[PDB]
């Protein structure tokens, strides 16, 4: 099982584009909004989410560190955004539940199982379409602007 | 020995046949970059006016390249010893060592380039 | 460079000093005990053949005469035996020169035989050697019975010496003072009672080389003015000189140590030379030993030049360390080597250096001190004097403790073969006549091998040039008893003889498809129908016109992958002239990556076709003469496929393999209008490169494509992009620019960031990993392809240790460089082999000196340290020490990358792997269970998985222009075709071919590590799938927990799946 920990990012938070959210660490393999937006929709009596930011990975995978570490020029854990300062106090009450249905009156298998998004044949593909074979459209458009 | 040798050094620097003698023990016991260091440092520290001093050492070391050094080595000394000393003296020098060595055709072309070089004015 | 020889010489005599209590009274209690019973042995009446075999019948002990024993219509003299007059001892021991040898040691002791038994004639015809070997018998019997039965005996030959027999005693016990001395394994390990000749008995001037003193014809012997016609016996003469001259020798080394007293070290330096060069006085190995080694710096004491001078490194107020070193030049330069055996003579006081004749002669006594050497041992000695005077040329590395072992004897070619010469005369094509039987000593075979594969490796050029196959050459036998037991006269064998025949090839010329000669003569000259041609070569001589307009005898061989042309000249010269016994050669690592091409396999001609003349035509020209803002410096060709280097030796076309994208360096001019950041640097060589793109396809040469793509080699760098050309002839070259500011300002963005403390090592990471993949390659590749044209097995070396860490799990994480400066280690440094002249032979001693390298004490140094090993003592961030002239800093291609440097991770089964693989060589052998280093053990692994390929069949072997995988018919030949791989679109269905595995684990190569670490099959560095997902492989990943995780506390940079406890 892939245990999730839940914590309060609320208390240190200064910037206006990290409120209202939750400290999140240890997320699985691939974690995505699809996958997150799925999860917090079977939670029940739960708000809107939008957006997630900072979500450079540093567990799934092997290496020394992750992608976007550094600003170059000048833990995996994430900021997972919702809706309004309504949406984020309903989903909280749902979490206080979840690391007690291991001793749910029922069973323990009433939790979510978690279901990944597998490489597959064409899919994981898109890794070679990018170090020789992107489309050639794009890449014209944005270094004539910089430029300029 | 080094430390004998020394101290013939240190008590006359000008003696370029101790000087030779020096560098001659060293191309016995076969140190031969230590022999070259000899016969430079002979070179630097040998009184300078002494020119006969100074130039046995350099027939010493023309010796000492034509024996076991190289073509490349035998060149660059032939010039340093051209712009240090006589340059006839040195090219006449150089042809006596190949007669001696037996390096008759390199010995043919230095004996014709010589006689390019310095036919103008030299009978000998 | 000599202060440091005369101390570690200092420390290696008080490691194998002796023991005083040791020599007196070990050795003088049998020595006065043994020379109390040879005295009271009595001596007998003279008798004859019949008397002599009536009582050696009866009599428990037996004579020993090689034959031919005398028979009695032949022998009509008379032996006898008289008691013993004289005693000394000779070699080693009388000198106290002596050292701790491990394996074996014997003093010898010398009887000699009185006047009166002896015969002025006796020099002729064996008869004298028969009655020393009467003596033998009579004085060992008389030994048994005087010994009371308790020391234990064999018989022997003495310096492998056939017509000298000798018997040789053991002890069995160990007491205190007594007299049995088992616990002393060099001085009283052996003893030999040599029985020889007194002094000037025999008349020396008829003793001569090329007096032929076994006289077998009689008729037409004469008239030949003097005596040519009788042929010289030089073995069999100098054996009677030396046992007749046993004692000059003696005083003369004794004078030898009383004028100079370092002969005592200078012998044992050169003693323990002998032993680790594997020789020793033996007839099988040269007959090198004490004897010609001291007797030989005796001589050259007392002269060797060729005026009479004096030797100048041997004054006798001299040192051990320029007496051995005097000593090894003399052998390397003057006569004591080759020059011996083809160029020249040497003489004894007053010596000197003339130049005619084999022969190392002594007059006053004529006797040749190399007799039982042969051109064989000629070569050997030459080119191990050779490097020993380099070795002791060298003044930066130290070398005193590597010294050579002779990968020359021992060669991956040792080719065994079975020679039954039994009978003689339709089992050998060499008539083994009264004639060869009278001239060699019982050394015929050898002599035949030695000269039949010589003229079999050996050609001759047009501008008279010798250039062979061949510079040196051995015959050792394998199953040679030179000791045996006491009831037989000869030493009989039932196996046969095995000769190996150890080869060091030499590589410029070892792969060339013709065999060269003499002029084709209009009239048959001698060497046109001598014994090294036509009738030598029988069906496979012709005639073939050559590029020099000259027409020569000439022969055709065939160039194939799995073995070699000269095996081919092998097995046929062998099976023509030695005879039909089997010749096979079994040792397989030739099946290799074989790139599929017309003529498999390709010699160095393939990587030099398609890189380099499709990289001139025509990429080069045209981005030279394109118009752009900004004009091209240099274009580089910087790969391994340049350097020669590359795994797979590629083709024109595939563009599924992992080695073909070419990674080039083009760089621009000295301009500063390039901006003062990384993303608009790396924008303006985007638009740059897109330029060059669309001004290359829209020129006349539009058949090539372009296309634009992103990189993720280096880290936070993510606006990269290439231009990756795909030529008509399905070249690909990874492009790349270079800028001075770029540089720089990767310099400052490592110098800022002071507030936060922990992020200085990943930027180092970072920069040295930019510097590893800009700066260094260029130069790097302009050494290697300048060692290229010297070392020729260097490409082929390569490919066998990076196939055999592809299939080791290693080269995920292991640069390509690393491996390449590994195996130019023991190119550029052989020491202490020779030189690697074989790709299977490189493979083993990278094998060799990867087990035998310690990386905790010693850093290498190649010609192609003291600050960082104080604050690592554990040596966790790094292991290895990669350095040379081209970089000091020995940290650039191994700290880098990231390897996990604990005792169980990636980087320290480098080293388990390496020790187990030498344990296959010496307890079983090398043969075709040698399959077990291509095969993984896939032990001490956490957890295993198996991963499986969408792949049709043979995919995706066929596509890399390697060829396993049979289901594809016509491997063998030009089956598959490369044009049919020029794609219509360049999105899928081109790069759907490719592995899904081998990407896998570069993406699944940038998250974790702090929870573990792996290695798989894929991201193996230059390596496709071809011959790791095959019968040889398997395509698996195996993970390894760190020990640094067991349990820990819950934080917040953690990372690691982890679970509650």
């Given at each position: 099982?892939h245990?999730?920990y839940?914590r309060?990012?609320?208390?240190?938070?200064?910037?206006?584009?990290?409120?209202?959210?939750?400290?999140?660490?240890?997320v699985?393999?691939?974690?995505?909004?699809?996958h997150?937006?799925?999860l917090?929709?079977?939670?029940?009596?739960?708000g809107?989410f939008?957006k997630?930011?900072?979500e450079?990975e540093?567990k799934?995978?092997?290496?020394?560190?992750g992608?976007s570490i550094?600003?170059a020029?000048?833990?995996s854990?994430a900021?997972?955004?919702?809706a309004?300062?309504?949406?984020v106090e309903q989903?909280?009450?749902?979490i206080a539940?979840?690391?007690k249905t291991?001793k749910?009156?029922?069973?323990?298998?009433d939790?979510?199982?978690?279901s990944?998004m597998?490489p597959?044949?064409?899919?994981?593909?898109?890794?070679?379409n990018?170090?020789?074979?992107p489309?050639?459209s794009?890449?014209?458009?944005?270094?004539?602007?910089?430029?300029? | 020995?080094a430390s004998?040798?020394?101290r013939?050094l240190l008590?006359?620097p000008?003696?370029?046949?101790l000087?030779?003698a020096?560098?001659a023990?060293?191309m016995?016991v076969n140190?031969?970059s230590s022999?070259?260091?000899?016969?430079?440092?002979a070179?630097?520290t040998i009184?300078?006016?002494?020119e006969?001093?100074k130039?046995?050492v350099?027939?010493a070391?023309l010796?000492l390249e034509?024996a076991?050094?190289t073509?490349?080595?035998?060149?660059?000394?032939?010039?340093?010893?051209?712009?240090?000393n006589?340059?006839?003296?040195?090219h006449?020098r150089?042809?006596?060592?190949?007669?001696?060595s037996?390096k008759?055709k390199?010995?043919e072309?230095?004996f014709?380039?010589i006689?390019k070089k310095?036919?103008?004015?030299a009978?000998? | 460079?000599?202060?440091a020889?005369v101390?570690?010489?200092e420390?290696m005599?008080?490691?194998?000093?002796?023991?005083?209590?040791?020599?007196f009274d070990?050795?003088?209690?049998?020595?006065?005990?043994?020379?109390?019973?040879?005295?009271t042995?009595?001596?007998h009446?003279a008798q004859?053949?019949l008397?002599?075999?009536?009582?050696?019948?009866?009599?428990h002990?037996?004579?020993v005469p090689?034959?031919?024993?005398?028979?009695?219509?032949?022998?009509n003299?008379?032996?006898?035996?008289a008691?013993?007059?004289?005693?000394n001892?000779?070699?080693?021991y009388?000198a106290?020169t002596?050292?701790?040898?491990?394996?074996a040691?014997?003093?010898?002791?010398?009887?000699?035989?009185?006047?009166?038994?002896?015969?002025?004639?006796?020099?002729?015809?064996?008869?004298?050697?028969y009655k020393?070997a009467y003596y033998?018998?009579?004085?060992?019997?008389?030994?048994q019975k005087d010994?009371?039965?308790e020391?234990?005996?064999?018989?022997?030959?003495?310096n492998?010496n056939?017509?000298?027999p000798?018997?040789?005693?053991?002890?069995?016990?160990?007491?205190?003072?007594?007299?049995k001395?088992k616990k002393?394994?060099?001085?009283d390990?052996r003893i030999r009672?040599?029985?020889?000749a007194?002094?000037?008995?025999?008349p020396?001037?008829?003793?001569?080389?090329?007096?032929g003193?076994?006289?077998?014809?009689?008729?037409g012997?004469?008239?030949?003015?003097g005596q040519?016609?009788?042929?010289?016996?030089?073995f069999?003469?100098?054996?009677?000189?030396?046992?007749?001259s046993y004692?000059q020798?003696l005083?003369l080394?004794?004078?030898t140590?009383?004028?100079?007293?370092?002969?005592?070290?200078?012998?044992?330096?050169?003693?323990?030379w002998?032993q680790?060069?594997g020789?020793?006085?033996?007839?099988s190995k040269?007959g090198f030993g004490?004897?010609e080694?001291a007797?030989?710096?005796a001589?050259?004491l007392?002269g060797?030049?060729a005026?009479?001078?004096?030797?100048?490194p041997?004054s006798?107020?001299?040192?051990?360390?320029?007496?051995?070193?005097?000593?090894?030049?003399f052998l390397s330069?003057?006569?004591f080597?080759?020059?011996?055996?083809?160029?020249?003579?040497?003489?004894?006081?007053?010596?000197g250096?003339i130049?005619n004749?084999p022969?190392?002669?002594?007059?006053?006594?004529?006797?040749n001190i190399?007799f039982?050497?042969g051109?064989?041992?000629?070569?050997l000695?030459?080119?191990?004097?050779?490097?020993?005077?380099?070795?002791?040329?060298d003044?930066a590395?130290?070398?005193?403790?590597?010294?050579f072992?002779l990968?020359?004897?021992?060669?991956?070619?040792?080719?065994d073969l079975?020679?039954?010469?039994?009978?003689?005369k339709?089992?050998?094509?060499?008539?083994?006549?009264?004639?060869?039987?009278?001239?060699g000593?019982?050394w015929?075979?050898?002599?035949?091998?030695y000269?039949?594969?010589?003229?079999?490796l050996?050609d001759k050029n047009?501008?008279?040039?010798?250039?062979?196959?061949?510079?040196?050459?051995?015959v050792?036998?394998?199953?040679s008893?030179?000791s045996?037991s006491l009831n037989?006269k000869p030493?009989?064998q039932?196996?046969?003889?095995p000769?190996?025949?150890?080869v060091?090839?030499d590589?410029?010329?070892?792969?060339?498809?013709?065999?060269r000669?003499?002029?084709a003569?209009?009239?048959?000259e001698?060497?046109?129908?001598?014994e090294?041609?036509?009738?030598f070569?029988?069906?496979?001589?012709?005639?073939?016109?050559?590029?020099?307009d000259?027409?020569?005898?000439?022969l055709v061989?065939?160039?194939?992958?799995?073995?070699d042309?000269?095996?081919?000249?092998?097995?046929?010269i062998?099976?023509?002239?030695?005879?039909?016994?089997?010749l096979?050669?079994?040792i397989?690592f030739?099946?290799?990556?074989?790139?599929?091409?017309?003529?498999?396999?390709?010699?160095?001609?393939?990587?030099?076709?398609?890189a380099r003349?499709?990289?001139?035509?025509?990429?080069?020209?045209?981005?030279?003469?394109?118009?752009?803002?900004?004009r091209?410096?240099?274009?580089?060709?910087?790969?391994?496929?340049?350097?020669?280097?590359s795994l797979?030796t590629?083709s024109?076309?595939?563009?599924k393999?992992?080695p073909?994208?070419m990674?080039?360096?083009i760089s621009?001019?000295?301009?500063?209008?390039?901006?003062?950041?990384?993303?608009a640097?790396?924008?303006t060589?985007?638009?740059?490169?897109?330029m060059?793109?669309?001004?290359l396809?829209?020129?006349?040469?539009?058949?090539?494509?372009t296309?634009v793509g992103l990189?993720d080699?280096r880290?936070?760098t993510?606006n990269?992009?290439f231009?990756?050309?795909i030529?008509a002839?399905?070249?690909?070259?990874?492009?790349?620019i270079?800028?001075?500011?770029?540089?720089?300002?990767?310099?400052?963005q490592?110098?800022?960031?002071?507030?936060?403390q922990?992020?200085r090592?990943?930027?180092?990471?970072?920069?040295?990993?930019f510097r590893?993949?800009?700066?260094?390659l260029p130069?790097?590749?302009?050494?290697?392809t300048t060692?290229?044209?010297?070392?020729?097995?260097?490409?082929?070396?390569?490919?066998?240790?990076?196939?055999?860490?592809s299939?080791?799990?290693l080269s995920?994480h292991?640069?390509p460089?690393?491996?390449?400066?590994f195996?130019?280690?023991?190119?550029?440094?052989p020491?202490?082999?020779?030189?690697?002249s074989?790709?299977?032979?490189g493979?083993?001693?990278?094998?060799?000196?990867?087990?035998r390298?310690?990386?905790?004490?010693?850093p290498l140094?190649?010609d192609?340290?003291?600050?960082?090993?104080?604050?690592?003592?554990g040596?966790?961030?790094?292991v290895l020490?990669v350095?040379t002239?081209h970089?000091?800093?020995?940290?650039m291609?191994?700290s880098?990358?990231?390897?996990?440097?604990?005792s169980?991770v990636?980087?320290?089964?480098?080293?388990?792997?390496?020790k187990?693989?030498?344990?296959?060589?010496?307890?079983?052998?090398?043969?075709?269970?040698v399959?077990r280093?291509?095969?993984?053990?896939?032990?001490?692994?956490?957890?295993?998985?198996?991963?499986?390929?969408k792949?049709?069949?043979?995919?995706?072997?066929?596509?890399?222009?390697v060829d396993?995988?049979?289901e594809?018919?016509?491997?063998?030949?030009?089956e598959?075709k490369?044009?049919?791989?020029?794609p219509?679109?360049?999105?899928?269905?081109l790069?759907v071919a490719?592995?899904?595995?081998?990407?896998?684990?570069k993406?699944?190569s940038?998250?974790y590590?702090?929870?573990?670490?792996?290695?798989?099959t894929?991201?193996?560095?230059?390596f496709?799938?071809?011959?790791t997902?095959?019968?040889e492989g398997?395509?698996?990943?195996g993970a390894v927990?760190?020990?640094?995780?067991?349990?820990?506390?819950?934080?917040?940079?953690?990372?690691t799946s982890?679970?509650?406890?």
């Open positions: 099982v245990y999730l839940v309060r990012h609320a208390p240190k938070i200064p910037t206006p584009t990290d409120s209202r959210s939750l400290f999140v660490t240890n699985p393999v691939d974690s995505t909004e699809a997150l937006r799925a917090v929709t079977s939670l029940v009596g739960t809107r939008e997630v930011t900072f450079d540093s799934q995978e092997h290496s020394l560190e992608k550094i600003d020029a000048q833990g854990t900021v997972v955004l919702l309004d300062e309504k949406s989903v909280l009450k749902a539940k979840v690391h291991k749910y009156p029922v069973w323990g298998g939790g979510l199982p978690d990944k597998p597959l044949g064409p899919v994981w593909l898109k890794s070679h990018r170090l020789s074979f489309d050639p794009m890449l014209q458009a944005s270094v004539d602007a910089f430029s300029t | 020995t004998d040798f020394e013939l008590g006359q000008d003696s370029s046949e000087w030779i020096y560098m023990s060293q016995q140190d031969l022999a070259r260091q000899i016969a430079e440092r070179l630097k009184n300078i006016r002494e006969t001093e130039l046995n350099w027939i070391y010796n034509v076991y050094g073509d490349e080595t035998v060149q660059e000394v032939f010039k340093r010893a051209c712009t240090y006589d340059d006839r003296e040195v006449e150089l042809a006596s060592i190949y007669i001696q037996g008759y390199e010995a072309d230095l014709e380039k006689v310095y036919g103008s004015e009978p000998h | 460079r000599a202060r020889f101390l570690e010489t420390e005599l008080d490691s194998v000093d002796l023991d005083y209590s040791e020599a070990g050795a003088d209690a049998l020595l006065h005990r043994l020379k109390g019973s040879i005295e042995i009595p001596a009446d004859p053949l008397d002599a075999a009536a009582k050696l019948e009866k009599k002990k037996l004579k090689f034959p031919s024993p005398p028979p009695p219509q032949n022998s003299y008379k032996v006898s035996f008691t013993p007059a004289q005693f001892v000779v070699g080693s009388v106290k002596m050292v701790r040898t491990q394996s040691h014997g003093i010898d002791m010398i009887v000699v035989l009185p006047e009166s038994i002896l015969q002025e004639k006796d020099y002729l015809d064996l008869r004298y050697f020393r033998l018998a009579v004085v060992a019997a008389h030994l010994l009371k039965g020391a234990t005996l064999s018989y022997e030959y003495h492998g056939s017509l000298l000798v018997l040789s005693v053991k002890p069995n016990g160990e007491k205190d003072e007594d007299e001395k002393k394994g060099v001085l390990y009672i040599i029985p020889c007194p002094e000037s008995f025999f020396r001037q008829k003793l001569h080389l090329g007096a003193l076994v006289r077998k014809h009689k008729e012997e004469q008239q030949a003015n040519p016609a009788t042929p010289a016996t030089p069999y003469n100098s054996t009677l000189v030396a046992e007749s004692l020798y005083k080394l004794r004078q140590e009383k004028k100079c007293a370092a002969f005592r070290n200078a012998c044992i330096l050169g003693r323990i002998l680790q060069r020789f020793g006085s033996d007839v040269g004490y004897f080694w007797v030989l710096l001589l050259l007392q060797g030049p005026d009479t001078k004096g030797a100048a041997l006798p107020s001299l040192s051990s360390t320029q007496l051995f070193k005097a000593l090894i030049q330069v003057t006569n080597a080759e020059k011996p055996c083809v160029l020249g003579q040497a003489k004894p006081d007053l010596a250096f130049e004749g022969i190392l002669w002594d007059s006053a006594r004529q006797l190399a039982k050497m051109p064989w041992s000629a070569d000695l030459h080119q191990h004097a050779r490097w020993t005077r380099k070795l002791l040329a003044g590395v130290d070398q005193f403790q590597p010294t072992i990968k020359a004897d021992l060669p991956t070619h040792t080719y079975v020679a039954r010469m039994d009978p003689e339709v089992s050998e094509a060499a008539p083994d006549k009264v004639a060869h039987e009278a001239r000593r019982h015929q075979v050898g002599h035949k091998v000269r039949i594969l010589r003229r079999a050996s047009m501008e008279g040039g010798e250039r062979a196959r061949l510079i040196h050459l051995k050792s036998p394998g199953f008893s030179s045996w037989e030493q009989p039932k196996a046969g003889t000769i190996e025949i150890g060091l090839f590589p410029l010329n070892m792969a060339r498809t013709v065999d000669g003499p002029s003569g209009p009239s048959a001698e060497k046109e129908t001598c090294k041609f036509r009738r070569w029988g069906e496979k001589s012709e005639l073939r016109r050559f590029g020099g000259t027409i020569r005898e000439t061989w065939s160039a194939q992958t799995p073995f042309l000269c095996e081919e000249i092998m097995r046929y062998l099976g023509l002239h030695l005879r039909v016994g089997q096979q050669d079994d397989v030739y099946g290799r990556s074989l790139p599929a091409l017309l003529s498999i396999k390709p010699s160095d001609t393939a990587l030099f076709n398609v003349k499709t990289f001139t035509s025509f990429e080069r020209d045209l981005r030279d003469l394109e118009d752009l803002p900004l091209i410096r240099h274009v580089n060709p910087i790969c391994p496929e340049l350097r020669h280097s797979k590629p024109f076309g595939p563009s393999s992992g073909r994208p990674e080039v360096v621009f001019e000295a301009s500063g209008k390039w901006p003062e950041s990384l993303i640097i790396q924008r060589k985007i638009a740059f490169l897109l060059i793109g669309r001004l396809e829209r020129f006349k040469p539009g058949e090539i494509r296309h990189d080699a880290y936070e993510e990269l992009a231009l990756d050309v030529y002839s399905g070249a690909c070259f990874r492009v790349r270079q800028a001075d500011l770029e540089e720089s300002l990767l310099e400052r490592t110098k800022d960031k002071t507030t936060e922990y992020l090592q990943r930027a180092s990471t970072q920069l040295a990993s590893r993949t800009f700066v260094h130069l790097h590749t302009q050494y290697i060692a290229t044209t010297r070392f020729p097995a260097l490409s082929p070396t390569i490919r066998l240790v990076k196939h055999w860490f299939v080791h799990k995920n292991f640069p460089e690393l491996l390449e400066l195996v130019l280690h023991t190119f550029l440094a020491y202490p082999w020779d030189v690697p074989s790709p299977t032979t493979f083993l001693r990278t094998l060799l000196f990867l087990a390298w310690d990386w905790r004490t010693d140094i190649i192609t340290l003291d600050a960082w090993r104080k604050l690592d003592p040596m966790q961030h790094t020490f350095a002239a970089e000091q800093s020995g940290t291609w191994t880098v990358d990231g390897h996990p440097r604990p169980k990636v980087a320290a089964r480098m080293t388990a792997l390496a187990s693989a030498a344990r296959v060589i010496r307890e079983q052998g090398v043969d075709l269970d399959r280093l291509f095969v993984p053990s896939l032990k001490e692994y956490d957890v295993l998985l198996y991963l499986n390929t792949v049709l069949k043979s995919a995706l072997r066929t596509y890399i222009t396993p995988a049979t594809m018919n016509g491997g063998k030949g030009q598959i490369f044009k049919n791989l020029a219509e679109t360049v999105e899928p269905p790069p490719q592995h899904p595995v081998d990407v896998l684990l993406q699944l940038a998250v590590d702090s929870a573990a670490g792996a290695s798989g894929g991201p193996l560095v230059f496709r799938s071809d011959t997902a095959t019968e398997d395509k698996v990943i927990w760190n020990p640094t995780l067991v349990k820990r506390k819950w934080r917040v940079n953690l990372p982890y679970k509650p406890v």
